[PDB]
Write a protein that binds this ligand. Structure first.
Ligand SMILES: COc1cc(C(=O)N2CCC[C@H](c3ccnc4ncnn34)C2)cc(OC)c1OC
Ligand SMILES: [Mg+2]
Ligand SMILES: [Zn+2]
Length: 324
């Protein structure tokens, strides 16, 4: 199969979660073919196949941080290649690392965040806490463990030099999915939207790849409302289990993690306005064809305000007040 999968597939309006979970591995392959990476770097196919599937299995099934997330982040990366040029901004090998990274970026996520790993004193906190980005270093570790499983090393044929460059890229890109990181380099991304991008400046390449990894990581918000609301549910279900476990542990979770304080409308708005929209504003400034994505997140930002009134109980819940 080539992108025979759906007519909208290369479109920003297409929703990869619509794709049956059983057909996602194959869709990965179809995107690597259409961007022409498999013939570029002459990837061994049965090897790549095994890799794809070790990646898929490397994900667990919490509400949001699961394989269909990873698939869907990957899909958006593909859409950036189709709809933005990117090749005039980044070396092909960087775009291919961006896509493989997308696939691998939340591997073996346990449905909880970095501070919780530290709070609960998990094995992952012991390993990585002192360097930061606990989960993201673990995600990167898992990719590496897969690449060094027999028959899964999709780069075993790369030049020593090219293989090294794939490891650095994947590492840096996976690391950049920590939203803490993004928020730290936001002023650096801003300098690269005032002074303009410099195709020869290596730090601009590095910074651009981070912007687009995030852009992919948050790409559920660029779809229609139906999707945005469903994904909100999945996210808070996941966050509220974390809050619950933290109370049990005798700690106060963040407002957004605590199901007795979380006001979903405010939290979504704030996320849309101050995290997600400025990300796609920077994407638009760097790429004019990225404008619709900004407009799509702003639509969704305005639509939560259109529906927040609904979170105040007017009338009776159910027809009962026994909940007081
Ligand atoms: C640093 O500030 C925030 C971080 C996160 C977060 O941890 N996220 C990582 C897990 C997927 C989340 C996500 C992904 C896609 N769409 C999302 N909508 C709301 N959260 N959200 C973001 C969420 C926030 O609000 C919901 C934040 O401020 C309001
Ligand atoms: Mg992540
Ligand atoms: Zn992610």
């Amino acid at each position: 199969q080539p992108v025979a999968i759906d007519s909208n597939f290369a479109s920003f309006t297409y929703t990869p979660r619509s794709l049956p979970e059983d057909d996602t591995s194959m869709a990965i392959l179809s995107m690597l073919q259409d961007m022409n990476f498999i013939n570029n770097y002459k990837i061994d196919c049965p090897t790549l196949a095994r890799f794809c599937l070790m990646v898929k299995k490397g994900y667990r099934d919490p509400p949001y941080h699961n394989w269909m997330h990873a698939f869907s982040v990957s899909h958006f990366c593909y859409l950036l290649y189709k709809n933005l040029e990117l090749t005039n901004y980044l070396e092909d090998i960087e775009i291919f690392a961006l896509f493989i990274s997308c696939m691998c970026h939340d591997l073996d996520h346990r449905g909880t965040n970095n501070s919780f790993q530290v709070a609960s004193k998990s094995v992952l906190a012991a390993l990585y806490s002192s360097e930061g980005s606990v989960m993201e270093r673990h995600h990167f570790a898992q990719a590496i463990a897969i690449l060094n499983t027999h028959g899964c090393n999709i780069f075993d044929h790369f030049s020593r030099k090219d293989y090294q460059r794939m490891l650095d890229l994947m590492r840096d890109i996976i690391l950049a999915t920590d939203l803490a990181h993004h928020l730290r380099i936001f002023k650096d991304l801003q300098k690269m939207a005032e002074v303009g991008y410099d195709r020869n400046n290596k730090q601009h390449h590095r910074l651009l790849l981070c912007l687009l990894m995030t852009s992919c990581d948050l790409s559920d918000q660029t779809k229609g409302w139906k999707t945005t609301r469903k994904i909100a549910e999945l996210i808070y279900k996941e966050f509220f289990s974390q809050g619950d476990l933290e109370k049990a542990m005798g700690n106060r979770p963040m407002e957004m993690m605590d199901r007795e304080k979380a006001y979903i409308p405010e939290l979504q708005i704030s996320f849309m306005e101050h995290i997600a929209m400025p990300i796609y504003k920077l994407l638009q400034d760097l790429f004019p064809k990225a404008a619709e994505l900004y407009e799509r997140v702003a639509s969704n930002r305005e639509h939560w305000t259109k529906v927040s009134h609904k979170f105040t109980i007017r009338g009776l819940p159910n027809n009962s007040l026994d909940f007081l």
